[PDB]
Unconditional design. Sequence first.
Lengths: 327, 310, 250
Amino acid sequence: IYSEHWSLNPLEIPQRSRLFSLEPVAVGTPYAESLSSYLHRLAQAHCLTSEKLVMGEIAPLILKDEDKSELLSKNLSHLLGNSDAKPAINGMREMTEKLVTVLEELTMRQDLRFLTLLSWKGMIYDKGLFRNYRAWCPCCCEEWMQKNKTIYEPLSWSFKDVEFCLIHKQRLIEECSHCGARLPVMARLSPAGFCSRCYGWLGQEIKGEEEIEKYRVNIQGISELIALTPQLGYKPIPIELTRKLQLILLVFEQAIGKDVKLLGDLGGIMESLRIASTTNQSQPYHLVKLIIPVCEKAKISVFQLFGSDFKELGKILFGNFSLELKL
Amino acid sequence: STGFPLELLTRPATERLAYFENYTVAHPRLKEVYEILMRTIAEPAGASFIFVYGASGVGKTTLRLRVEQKLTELALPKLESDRARVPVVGIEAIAPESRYFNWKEYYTRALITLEEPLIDHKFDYGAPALRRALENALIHRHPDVFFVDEAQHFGKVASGYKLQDQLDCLKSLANMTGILHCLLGTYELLTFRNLSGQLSRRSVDIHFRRYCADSPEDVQAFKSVLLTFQQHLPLAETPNLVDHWEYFYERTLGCIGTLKDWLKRVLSDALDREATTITLKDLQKRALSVAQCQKMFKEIQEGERQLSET
Amino acid sequence: IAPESRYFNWKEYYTRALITLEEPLIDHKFDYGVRGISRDNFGKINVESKVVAPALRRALENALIHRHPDVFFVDEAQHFGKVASGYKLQDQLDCLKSLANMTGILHCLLGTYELLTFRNLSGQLSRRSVDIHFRRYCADSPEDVQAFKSVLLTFQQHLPLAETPNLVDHWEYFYERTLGCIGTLKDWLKRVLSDALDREATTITLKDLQKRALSVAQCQKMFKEIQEGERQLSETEADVQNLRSALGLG
DNA sequence: GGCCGCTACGTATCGTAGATATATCTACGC
DNA sequence: GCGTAGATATATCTACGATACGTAGCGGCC
Ligand SMILES: Nc1ncnc2c1ncn2[C@@H]1O[C@H](COP(=O)(O)OP(=O)(O)OP(=O)(O)O)[C@@H](O)[C@H]1O
Ligand SMILES: [Mg+2]
């Protein structure tokens, strides 16, 4: 006879993700997808509106004590807080924190924290950093759609001090050309590249003919800041950044000691760094107001400042100011 | 071993019935079809359809579950690393209450199987919304195969040309996701096998042949499966079943599943009466009606004639 | 349910199955699928006409798999045969088979001899169904005749009357009317006993049986459909040989 | 054997009830 | 101080069912 006896018992595979495990686009590069664009992409992949998916799954995990079905028939602002809203949701705010935590738990993904700036909480001041209204680069969207590439909004577009796309040298457009209104970042249905109000198109060959060199340092520094966070491999330590700033201050002081003229070029930044080192270290520092000009005068990229260790940073500073020190 | 565990005699009747019901035997046709199906699954070779025919009771459902389980355990070592990676998906088609087959029900049931959240609410980013949701779910969840049991219910349409339009809709679902579709059904399946070049090229046909009484090798195989079923019957005494091989074949038509369910009925009847052996009248009590056997034989003969194209 | 229209209404069947199955105490909060079905203040579930039939069917599937009854009884199942398309009988039976399938619940159908229209209408339903014949009492075989005599004796012994009437003499008359059917005989005896109690008569006179008997036209129509179905439901050794011959097993 | 009339059925269409997009007033948090 | 959200009414779109009409297949007559 036949000795083979099959067994059809189930195998009990590990629990699957509640939502699709969509990869974030261009993580670690100056063109990383914003959390808002990722939310809209996940909603589009599920054939659900961002609002509807939000109260379907994120709201019960965010809003702890409510009836989930009764939450299914509300406005997005009840849990997002549209009184604030703004592209600042991409920042380091509390609702951003809990939203990122819930999203990472739902898809068991380990990179959504890089799609925002919670890794820089306590490091970079929130005020004066993010735009109030949605912005886009029409050339980017048109090129992406023509090349059959995924549409999304980079983090750089959410910053006030980023107004130009270095790829296309085009000033960011905050107003829909069709309806004339300015889109909020969060809406009931706002797929990337589309007008959240009139459903019109926002990608056109718009030419940028301004002095982009003025804002080049700011945009490149912010791009480096976004692109560097996923590559660190750890949560940054506040006093690490504080002591790097202090080391740059000491290098500045030694350079001034060697050359008196440099005091004229660096006095204001010296005073600002001294104040930032005398105030509480746990207090965040204003990114564009303090760190970017400081590393600019130090002739050091934001990537070099936040990435290199103390030895490399000290050696490069000494070489940059031609000092004879060796740490 | 050829014998059932000997401590099962002291156990209650329910335990013996359970041991018998979750026990299944591998006869040569079933294992051959299993190897062929898994070879096609591992290497689709550009074919998006693995249509499997067979008589009512050859073991189509059992083969489906076995393939699902084995592919699941083959994929298991890597599901810990990668999530949203359902290995295989197997659902059964629903006969429509209305005259025509319903596709909204098909799409929503497929979404239910994939644990799609907020299926009822949905939206259309442009049943088109349900179809797009199913396409996206198949693309992202990345299933290896897609079994659709009882594929004869697909052609519950009064239009002869829409009969292949059902498979046209399934095919349009398949291409934009590139997921293998291995449909299973009865002989009312050949009305869908190779219609049009699209379904004639990318479809691989597997026939779950039954055990016919003409070839002496098949007769010997049927006798051997009878012998192993007798030796695996959880009774105090082993009844002699190989002798009435003609009687067992008459009411089963060679379908191994029919033999299994008939023997399950007889064993349960014996256990309820606390009997120790199986009598001929015990088999006669729960035998299938002659008219029923005639009807299924006519159906499988017509199916074999249709599939006899060379 | 026999439908008013020419089509069997599957939506009504599904909602009636749901309401009949869902009648336990209020403690079970199952939370069925689909938004259109829920409980109420009085405990009886409500279904809106907006809900489509397949969604109600899916809710019934979920309820059946959760409750897991042993058997689903359907009386006068021949009402499934009210359609307009000739092939639609197979469609109805396939829908019922599919239903029972994913639910895994054995569906038992009880009906008259016209239920035989779905007997072996296809091989898949032919295998997955077994048939039980509720045969009446015939006349050619003396065994069923003696059984009918014993039933008549028991009924006449159990009649609440001062004098136990002799029902054994007119057994031919009772068989001619009741056609052996035990239920018809019981109803006839019920009518006769009610009349006797109205007259307070300590006995059942023959003419009393003729008062509440059935018209010969009714009885002839009874036996006309009974004999027609019996030959369809007759299995002989002749039907075995060709089956053995056709399979090559001869 | 051929042509005409009947009628059974599919189907386009239109009505109708419910979901919903949105505009507007008012309060409140930023 | 002003945005900005929340509530609500309302017509209008939309899904679904009922219905009358066109047509083709089939039965009847020369
Ligand atoms: N080789 C086998 N050994 C043991 N039991 C079997 C075998 N093949 C089928 N069965 C039994 O048959 C039942 C499963 O149904 P089966 O696959 O035989 O039917 P099918 O007609 O091919 O499928 P379906 O009706 O779902 O299309 C189970 O009770 C299973 O134990
Ligand atoms: Mg089966």
